[PDB]
Amino acid sequence: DTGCAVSWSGKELKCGSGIFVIDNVHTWTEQYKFQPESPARLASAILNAHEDGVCGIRSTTRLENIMWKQITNELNYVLWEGGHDLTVVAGDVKGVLSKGKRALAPPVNDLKYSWKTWGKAKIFTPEAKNSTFLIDGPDTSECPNERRAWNFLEVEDYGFGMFTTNIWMKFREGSSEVCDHRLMSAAIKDQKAVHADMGYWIESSKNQTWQIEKASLIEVKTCLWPKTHTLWSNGVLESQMLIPKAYAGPFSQHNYRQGYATQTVGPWHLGKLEIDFGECPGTTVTIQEDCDHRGPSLRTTTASGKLVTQWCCRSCTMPPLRFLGEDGCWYGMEIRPLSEKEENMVKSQVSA
Amino acid sequence: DTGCAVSWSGKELKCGSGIFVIDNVHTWTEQYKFQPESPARLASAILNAHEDGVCGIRSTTRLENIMWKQITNELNYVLWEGGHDLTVVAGDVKGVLSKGKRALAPPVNDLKYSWKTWGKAKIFTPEAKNSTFLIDGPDTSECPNERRAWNFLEVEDYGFGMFTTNIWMKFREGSSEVCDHRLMSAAIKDQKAVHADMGYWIESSKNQTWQIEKASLIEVKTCLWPKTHTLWSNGVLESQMLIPKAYAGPFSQHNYRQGYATQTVGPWHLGKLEIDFGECPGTTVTIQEDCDHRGPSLRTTTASGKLVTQWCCRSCTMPPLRFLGEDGCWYGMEIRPLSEKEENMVKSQVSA
Amino acid sequence: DTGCAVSWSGKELKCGSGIFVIDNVHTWTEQYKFQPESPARLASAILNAHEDGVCGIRSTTRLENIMWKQITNELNYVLWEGGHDLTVVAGDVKGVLSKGKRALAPPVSTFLIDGPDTSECPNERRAWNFLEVEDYGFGMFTTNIWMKFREGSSEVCDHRLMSAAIKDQKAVHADMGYWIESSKNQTWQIEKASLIEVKTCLWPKTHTLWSNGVLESQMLIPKAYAGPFSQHNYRQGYATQTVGPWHLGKLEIDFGECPGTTVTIQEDCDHRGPSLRTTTASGKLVTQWCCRSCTMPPLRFLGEDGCWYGMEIRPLSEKEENMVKSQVSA
Amino acid sequence: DTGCAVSWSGKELKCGSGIFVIDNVHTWTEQYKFQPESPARLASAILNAHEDGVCGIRSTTRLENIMWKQITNELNYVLWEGGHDLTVVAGDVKGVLSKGKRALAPPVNDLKYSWKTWGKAKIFTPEAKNSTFLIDGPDTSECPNERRAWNFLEVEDYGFGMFTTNIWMKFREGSSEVCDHRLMSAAIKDQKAVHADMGYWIESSKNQTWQIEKASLIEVKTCLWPKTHTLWSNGVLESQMLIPKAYAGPFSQHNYRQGYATQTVGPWHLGKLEIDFGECPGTTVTIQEDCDHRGPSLRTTTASGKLVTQWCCRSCTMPPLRFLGEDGCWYGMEIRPLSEKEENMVKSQVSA
Amino acid sequence: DTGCAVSWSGKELKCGSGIFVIDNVHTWTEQYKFQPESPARLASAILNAHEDGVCGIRSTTRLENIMWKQITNELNYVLWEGGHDLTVVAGDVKGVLSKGKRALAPPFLIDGPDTSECPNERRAWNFLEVEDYGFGMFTTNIWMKFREGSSEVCDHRLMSAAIKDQKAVHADMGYWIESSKNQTWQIEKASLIEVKTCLWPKTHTLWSNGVLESQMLIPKAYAGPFSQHNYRQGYATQTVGPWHLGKLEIDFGECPGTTVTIQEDCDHRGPSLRTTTASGKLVTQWCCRSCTMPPLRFLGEDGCWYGMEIRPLSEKEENMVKSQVSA
Amino acid sequence: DTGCAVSWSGKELKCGSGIFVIDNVHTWTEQYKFQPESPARLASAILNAHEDGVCGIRSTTRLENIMWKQITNELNYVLWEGGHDLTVVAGDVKGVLSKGKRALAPPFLIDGPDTSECPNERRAWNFLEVEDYGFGMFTTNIWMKFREGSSEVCDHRLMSAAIKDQKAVHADMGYWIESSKNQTWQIEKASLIEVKTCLWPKTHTLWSNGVLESQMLIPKAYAGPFSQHNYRQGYATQTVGPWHLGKLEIDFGECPGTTVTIQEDCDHRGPSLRTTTASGKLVTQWCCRSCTMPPLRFLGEDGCWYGMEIRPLSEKEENMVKSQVSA
Structure with a gap:
């Protein structure tokens, strides 16, 4: 990656060639876009999966969820054009991106379609019902996580540009539990x-x-x-x-x-997080040996809205571990309360 | 590191904050310049080490030899004006940067000197006093590596600029065989x-x-x-x-x-090297199972100057391993000669 | 122009001033927009052209078709106000941008702007290549081009672009x-x-x-x-390549083999002929082609409906009667 | 060439991939630098050419004259240490880069040397012995242009960098009168x-x-x-x-x-030039039918300092063609002076 | 600010660390963008100001007005969800940014033409200040907040x-x-x-x-x-200059076809006058008492204006365009 | 000045046109160098000045003493060419570049110690002026000339x-x-x-x-x-601070291995004192009357000093190291 950069201290300006690892969370520009294989191939894979017994798809990253919410109408129109009953419903991501136990194999005997790109203002086919292919959405019992597809897409090549850049996806050749290494x-x-x-x-x-x-x-x-x-x-x-x-x-x-x-019982149910080491505003943490053992992470403010002031830790190190969620400020599993009572506060919704 | 870069494929331009790992072998600019502690501290440490029993100094990096060579004269001037019976001789690096078995400890009660920086009007002291503190050079027996200092410097901050940047060194608190991690x-x-x-x-x-x-x-x-x-x-x-x-x-x-x-017995005695996988000009390597076992690396050019054309390996993979140096082109330990009477070829001087 | 650029090999970063010719097919931004003169001058021009025989127009660039599609609505309110009994009909492009033999003139029962081949309005009575640039907006996040009428008939592409x-x-x-x-x-x-x-x-x-x-x-x-x-x-x-897959519209000329196919050089092959697709009407892939005196890698067209070969490559293990040939005038 | 450029009017910014042609004439500092093959090969080529009759070298560009002037010392070193006697002198360039009729073929053998680079092992080489190989210089008659090499180098590849980049040269295989297309x-x-x-x-x-x-x-x-x-x-x-x-x-x-x-008889003997279309300071040009025929280019000011003010052209169009050299401001071959005559003023030394 | 720059002469490229003052008036693109605090606080403050006895606000800079026009819809939606009887109208600005006399306190016509129904004496002004700067290269965001006190001074972080x-x-x-x-x-x-x-x-x-x-x-x-x-x-x-225009371009020169001569007998100092009359007749002869060339030359949407000392000598004051501001 | 630069926080990259004020103490390149007006003109100025009764000059900028030392030999050779009975020596200056009370009119010790034979009361000072810059990236010259009249103000072109x-x-x-x-x-x-x-x-x-x-x-x-x-x-x-060191570094922190506390019963304000005694022992207790922390600290060449408002507590000021200027 040929280019120039200034050091952390700002005292240097070094130009050369190497590897530049850029922050994509605070991305300075528009985000990457995932582009799928084709309307014909995806429909064939989904149909074959529904034949096999898969009741839905569980996403791996938020960009993939955006792609699935984007291509749903074209997928439904392609499915309707074949004259077979199936409906694809795209939901939203709420909390931890859970994992399924199935996969979509690369489909042989591709369906019939004329286009290769996405988006030509199709018609909203009325929901045929009696057969659905849920994508993401809330955790229900009609389509549990034991019968959902997960981790079956991978990068095939990147795109071009400076602000808007596309990433082209394709099916995997097997089943893996490892994240996609090309990202x-x-x-x-x-x-x-x-x-x-x-x-x-x-x-x-x-x-x-x-x-x-x-x-x-x-x-x-x-x-x-x-x-x-x-x-x-x-x-x-x-x-x-x-x-x-x-x-x-x-x-x-x-x-x-x-x-x-x-931190297995942290506030992972929030989704977006911010791990930092410090004190939430208005609280004090003291290292004292007469403290409780570990447990679920607790929020500093009760559901009523009252702020707990005094917390104690047994054998951790200052500054304490702190999570910045959307709703409030959380502490780690080692920081226990002594001002108020543990039974009267909000704990982590994640299972112990 | 805030900056911009063009990707490997050359179709993107990404700007942001992160870590830019730059090639320093091919600098695009002037090399880094090591800057030592002080004429008073270094001379005192050298004198204390000589009294303790340290015979010389072995450089760890080729950037340290230049520093020693440029500060030798000031070291000698400080030692002479301090009325001490010792001289410092700075050699050159040829081959592998060998390893010493001692170190220079940080000094207390430093010597006396005019300035703190390096560079002032001085005089040339005579080469005398019948006591030499060798720095680098050829492998001798009057000053074996068992009584030499090695790996006692470390970075304490960086400089500023775009073309020429200084690195300020200090003394290690302890002893270690690990390379300095700030470079x-x-x-x-x-x-x-x-x-x-x-x-x-x-x-x-x-x-x-x-x-x-x-x-x-x-x-x-x-x-x-x-x-x-x-x-x-x-x-x-x-x-x-x-x-x-x-x-x-x-x-x-x-x-x-x-x-x-x-590759323990490769052509490491050369110093400069370029490891890449391919064919030396005018030769060929083929897979055979009747070939002899691996041994010391050999050159494709004999002592007289003729060229060896037929080579074979036992179970290696193509393209073959190839070392490029100032002498010529070398092969790895697995590729063996098949045409030129291995007892009549130049072999690696690394001890087998 | 003034700026910096990293070379093709990626080993240099040269800054200075000169001329920077940029890929505009892969824009890095949004595409340009053609801006016509005014809603009234075009209406007068098309009315005058329809008065003396012109039944339609053909676009010269894919941007002009977008411009006409955008402008047709405003060119009609006025065209039906003045009481003139004429309505302009828009249309899309599919295939090549065909040629016309007429042209509009500057100003002082349907009009077809692009579309399919119709005997009602043949190309010999259709205007073509009469618009040209007058200035630019050449920057980031938005671009506009202001067009104007051409004076004389010409068969040369507009050089400003x-x-x-x-x-x-x-x-x-x-x-x-x-x-x-x-x-x-x-x-x-x-x-x-x-x-x-x-x-x-x-x-x-x-x-x-x-x-x-x-x-x-x-x-x-x-x-x-x-x-x-x-x-x-x-x-x-x-x-x-007088007879190639030009009917597709979008193309991508490159040299190689379409997946699952191989080409060799043998003289016992049919002579030069129209380009053929690698998949038959049923969809069966043909895997054996040969060329008489071509060079490798072979010429290859990549349309949106499959992969094609050039006129100098013909199949050997299949009969051309069951193959799809290029739908261009041979 | 992926990068960004500010438009001609300075009101726009555009980024993309393409070809960026840079003015190398007014570019702050020198941007390119020629690098010869090796000290052994050039000396061998010089001896092989001198054995055939070539007694000098003319430069094709001004970036090659600098290279010759900067490498004319290691050549002398190699020639002296080889045993044979031959001295190489590198002159400067005056006016036009004239054309030679010979060339240097790549040597078949080579002279022994211990360095593949330039800038080492030189004292003064105090050996001339009237065996001179003149490089550039003035127009002499001992070694005329009919027996002098010209246009035998071509680019091998480009270097790396941002401000100054090396261009690696090598010997051409056949004679040609065309400039090197790779520059x-x-x-x-x-x-x-x-x-x-x-x-x-x-x-x-x-x-x-x-x-x-x-x-x-x-x-x-x-x-x-x-x-x-x-x-x-x-x-x-x-x-x-x-x-x-x-x-x-x-x-x-x-x-x-x-x-x-x-303009075959223009002021091409000056070297540097700036062709523009306008008026030299305080001078008037008109179109008259009775003007004389074509003639060589003339300077506006006589050697004494007499500034001609009246000029006329028979068929030219204003603004007139002018050359801005070091000495003064000139005109083209179609502009004749109404005052004075072409007998007491300076013409162009180029003539047929 | 670590970086490089090419000098005015165009011959030198100097790199180093220091302070880079950049022209924000003449830019390639929109370089900054104001970002409000929150739709909740910005509604409670407006409501409390409404019961405090104010009927709107005047923008301080031409970015605060854009921010108000962009967040006015969300402010209205939140206020309507709160169950109240207030409606905020985000108007435009016509020339000079006149100042208010009230302020908004930390926990309803905005801008627009001058109306006697909601005078400047019962309106807020200059209550927003910079909190922090955002990241980016082209669309850096600036975060706003409220002031504890009140002041007539501009914001010094811009x-x-x-x-x-x-x-x-x-x-x-x-x-x-x-x-x-x-x-x-x-x-x-x-x-x-x-x-x-x-x-x-x-x-x-x-x-x-x-x-x-x-x-x-x-x-x-x-x-x-x-x-x-x-x-x-x-x-x-130039207290009585053409400040009513809004955008301006102050320069020293001569507008086409005009001439200024220095004489002592010329008309005394007065309000600014445009170079062209109401009909459009171009006055081609002006005069000044004690000016130095080139004269004050305002340029805006009206073509040309002259300063308070460049009076016309080949024209009368009966039919001329004068500066709107009154003294 | 047109270019790009990253902010101090290092989280944004701004490009445009303006003025770039670059640190020249840390040059990033080679240091500047002055060039005299004319080798012959300086000799005539020296001749008629020492005829007028000046015994040399005092350098005002350390980049001018370099030029004087560079050209002193050539100037003396020019003097000898005419057989003139005058000698010039270009000494060195360490510490304050003290002020001379004379001038060098347009058509003999330079710098050195406080010589009693040529006092500062009749020595020229501050008589150069920049007239051009030139070009160059790794090296740039500065063309100097003579000043028209007396002036006790530093040259503003630098x-x-x-x-x-x-x-x-x-x-x-x-x-x-x-x-x-x-x-x-x-x-x-x-x-x-x-x-x-x-x-x-x-x-x-x-x-x-x-x-x-x-x-x-x-x-x-x-x-x-x-x-x-x-x-x-x-x-x-800080009138009586360690200004005799020449190179200084004013900073607000703590010298190594020392502490400061604020006590009401502290000494009055006097000359600056170093953290090390005349022999080399370190003082580790200081107090101030009304200072604010961190304390003032001059990181000089020979050690670490404190300001005039900081006094020792565990040492006697009678035997210490004390500033040598107007003590």
Whole structure:
């Protein structure tokens, strides 16, 4: 990547060729766009899956959800043109991007269509009912996660441009639990590391030791971070990774904070998050040994709206771990309350 | 690092904030310039080490030898005006930057000198006093490597500018065999990784498999690559690293090529190197199972100057491993000669 | 122009001032908009043209069709106010931008703007190539072009919209809908082409590199389809593709093999003939083709309905009676 | 060339991919620098040519004269240490880059040397012995242009960088009178054309007609402009090219002006030039039918300093053609003075 | 600000670290964009001001007006959801940004033509200030907030000033005042996209001592720098200039076909007059008492105007276009 | 100036046209160099000046002493060419570039120590002036000439001053004064490669109104800007600071291994003292009467000093290191 850049301190201007790992969470421009295979191939794959027994699709990233919500009308029109009963319904992402257990195989015997691009102001075919293919949406029991397709698309090549850039997708050749590696990055220089993809930005630095310092999560995935794109992958213990392994956290020793264990019962149900180390406004945390053990992460403000003032921690390190959700301010699993009572506050909706 | 860059394919232009890992072997500008502590501190440390029993100094990087060569005169002037019976001789680096077994400790009660910076009107002291403190040079027996200092400097901040930038060094608090981590970097994005350094530039890519593809070494160090700056460093066998662990090769699985093992007896005595996979001009390599076992690396040109045309490997992979130096073109340990009486060829001077 | 650019190899970053010929087929932004003179002058012009025999017009560029589609509504209110009994009918483009033999004049029972081939309004009574640029807005996030009437009849494409550049070992003949690339690998020959449309006007020779000693029976893109009159518009072993898949509209000329197909060089093959698709009407892929005296990799057209080969490549393990041939005038 | 550029009017910004032709004549600092093959090969070629009769070298561009002047010392070193006697002297350039009739073929053997680069192992080489190989210099008669090499180098590839980039040269395989096509450019957009070069920048434009409007020469070559890099090269008469064919003028109809013809006897002996269409300071030109015929170009000011004020042209069109050299302001071949006569004023030394 | 720049002469490319003052008046694109605080607070504040006895607000800069026009619909929607009887109308601006006398407090015609139903004495003005700057390259966002107190001074986080060799400039989001030294330090040109009425802060002013509020060409009332660079030889303050136009372009020169001569007997100082009469007759002979050439030349939507000292000698005051502002 | 630059926060990249004030103390390139008017003219000026009764000159800028040392030998050779009984030596200056009370009229010790044979009372000073710049990227020349008359003001063609948002700067080729706002405008840093004595012109000074000469942290006598940005809370003018060092570095922090506390029963205001004794022992306890933290600190060549308002607590001032200027 030929170009120029200024250092972190602003004292240098170095030009050359190498690898530039850019923040795509605070993206300076318009976001990437996912473009699918074709109206004919996707319809054939969906029809074959419905023949097999798959009742829907569960997305992997928010960009894929945008693509699915975008191509739904054309998919429905293509399905209606074949004179067979099936309806595709596209929902919204609410919380953690859950995972299915099925997949869409590359369809042989492609259907009949005349176009290869997307979008020509089609007609809204009336819902034929009696057969639906739910995409995303709320967690129901008629189409559980055990019969949904998940993690079957992958990058085939990037596009061109400066503001609007397209990414072209295609089906996978197998079933994998690992995240798509062509959307991910990792970099280290001097005393600053980073793990980045389209929806994660985990920043790490050295101050007498290497540990995580920031994390901006505009989505919560469930696939695995590939180890080919991970710094310092040796000797990693799964009980030490701050961002859990189950939520696409790097299998790295840069993903670590001293005094804290894995945050499995954090406020992951929010979706967008902001991991930072500090104190929520109006609260004080003190390290005292006469404290309770770990438990679900709690919000500083009760459902009524009263702010709890005093919190105590047993063996963590200041400043305390703090999550910035949309509704309020949360603490980690090691920071317990002593001002108010635990039974009268909001805890993490995630299952223990 | 805030800046802009044009991607590898040259069809995009992305601007933002992140980490830009730049090739420093091909600088585009002037090289970095090491700047030592002070004429008073260095002379005191050298005198204390000489009293303790340290005989000389071995450079860790080719950028440190230049600093020693430019500060030798001021060191000698300080020692002479302090009335001390010692002289400092600065040699040159030829071959591998060998490893010493001692270090210079930080000094207390520094010497006396006029200024703090480097460069003032001085005089040339006579080469005398019958006591020499050798810096680098050829391998001798009056000053063996068992009594030499090595790896006792580290970065404490950077300079400013675009063409010429200074790096200010200090003294290590302890002793370590690991390379200084403030001069190193590593990055990965999409399907291209890199392990950069002041004199190392290892490139890797994915074509059905992650394996090394290029390496430009303008020096051959002997410290260890820190594992905090390594990608994919789990499940690594030391028998498979193409660049050996003893020559500051990354402890990674991107440091790997299929069909080859660790190249312990390569042409490392050259210094400058260019590792790439291909054919030396005018030769050919073919797969045969009657070939003999791997041995020391051999050159395609004999001592007289004639060319060897027929080569064969046992179970290697094509294209073959090829070392390029100032002498000529070399092959890896697996490729063997088939036409020119191996007992009459130039072999690597690395101890077997 | 003044700015910086990273070279093709990506090893240099050169800044300065000069001329920067940019790909406009892949715009990096939104496409240009043609802005006509005024709602009243066009109505008078079309009324006068209909008075003396002109029954319709043909667009010269795909942008002019968009302009006409946008403007037809306002050109009618007035055209039915004044009491004149005439209504202009719009239309779309499918295939090549065919040629006309008439032209509108500056101002002092239907009119068809583009459409399919109809005997009611033949092309010989249709205006064509009468609009030209008067200035630009050439920037980011929005662009507009102001058009005006042409004075005399001409068969030459409007030169304000065209470009051409050569540096080192790479040439290019750019346009609003054309992008022809040339390169030197032991010789100068065409390398790529990205036709987002197909025109019928002539490429002006003021915007052409290497215009001397050119034979019309060697130009890969025929001069009847706005192909440059250049020796960079040439591939070794091939002649002018007078009969190709031009009926598609969008094309992409490149050299290679369509997936699941192989081409060899044997002399026991049928002679040069119309271009054929790789899939029959049923949809069965043909996997054996041969060429008489062509060169590899073979010429290949990539339309929206499949993959095609040039006139110099014919099938051997299949009969052309069951193949789809190019629907152009042979 | 992916990048961004500000439009001619300065009110717009456009980014994209294409070809960016840069003015190398007025470009702040020098942007390109020639690099020869190797000290051994050039000396061997010089000996092989001297063994056949070639007694010198003429430069094709002014960026090659600098290279010769900067490498004329290691050549002497190699020749002296080889044992044979031959001295190489590198002169300067005056006026037009005249044309030679010989060339240097690539050597079949080579002379022994221990360096593949330039800038080492030189003392003074105090050996001439009247065996001189004159490079450039003045027009002498001991070694005339009939026995002197010219136009034997061509570009191998370009270097890397941002401000100064190396161009790697090599020996041509066959003789040719055409300039090296790999250093040239040409571009047209809307109504602005240009024919660029390393020392040429010829501009054209349309105002009711396509004709030349401005030229800027920092050297006067004598090779031929290749027609592969020439816009509108059909139906061209050699009698109307404003810049003659013998001086590397494009064989184009953009190299044209109304009312003028080829300027074969213009002030081409000055070297640098600035062709413009206007009036020299304080001078008047009119069109008269009784003016004399064509004639050589003349300066406005006599050697004493007498500024002629009355001029006339028989068929030219205003503004008149003028040359802005170092000494003063000149006119074209079709402008004659009404005052004085062509007997007490300076003509152009170029003549037939 | 680390970066590179090419000098005025065009011959030098100097790179370094320091402060880069950039012309926001003449830009490639829209360089900044105001961003309000929140639709909730911005409705409670408006409601509380309504029961406080105000009937609208006057914009301070031509970006605050755009922000109000862009968020007025959401403000109306929130207020209507709150169950109230208030309706906010986001009007336009006609020339000068006249100042209000009230303010909005932290926890309804906006702009528009002057109406006696809602006078300026019962209206708010200059209550928004910068909180932070956004990231980006072309569309940087600026975050607004409320002021605890009240002041007549402009917001100082949107203003600049610079001097180097002999070239000064006083710049902000809508002003670009230039100066230079030609045997004297005096103004050279200006480019006012808008016309404000707040005070230019003295912390962002060069050469702020020994300044009399009768020689500044741009008056103290219209946000003119309190500087000696805001000065021209022979002139005085242009309090009755064509400030009603809005956009302006101050320059020194001669409009086509006109001539100014210096005589003592000429008419005394008065309001500005346009070069063309109401019908369109072009006056081609003017005069001045003690002016220095080139004369004050305002350029806007009306073609040309002249300063308060360039009077017509071949024309009478009976039929001329005069400056709208009254003294 | 046209180019691009990243902001101080490093989160935005702005391009456009304006004025770029670049730090020249940290040049990013080679240092500037002066060029004399004419080798022959200087000799005639020296001849008729020493005939007029001046015993040399005093350099005002460290970039002028370089030129004098460069051309002293050629000037002396020119003097000898005519057989003139005069000798010139170009010495070195360390510390303050003290002021001379004479001038060098257009058509003999240079610098050095405080020689009693040629006092500053009859030595020329401040008689050059820039007339052109030229071109160049890695190296640029400066063409100097002679000044027409007496003037105790530094040459203004070498200076700069800029402000933007909440960060000002006062710069020339030997000074780099930085200012900022954190609840108030006060000086935060300073880089002095030299110590001059001419006056900073007020044409290149931000916020020059209502300035008391006793509050300027960098005194008026040492080319301190006549500005309210040249001010720190809780201090006064540092007239007796360590100005003899030559190169200084004004910063607000703590010298290594030392502490400061605020106590009411503290000594009065006097000369500056170093953290190390005359022998080398370190003082680790200081107190101030009314200072604000962090304390003033001059990071000089030979150590780490404190301001005139800071007094030791665990050491006696009778035997310490004390400033050598007007003590």
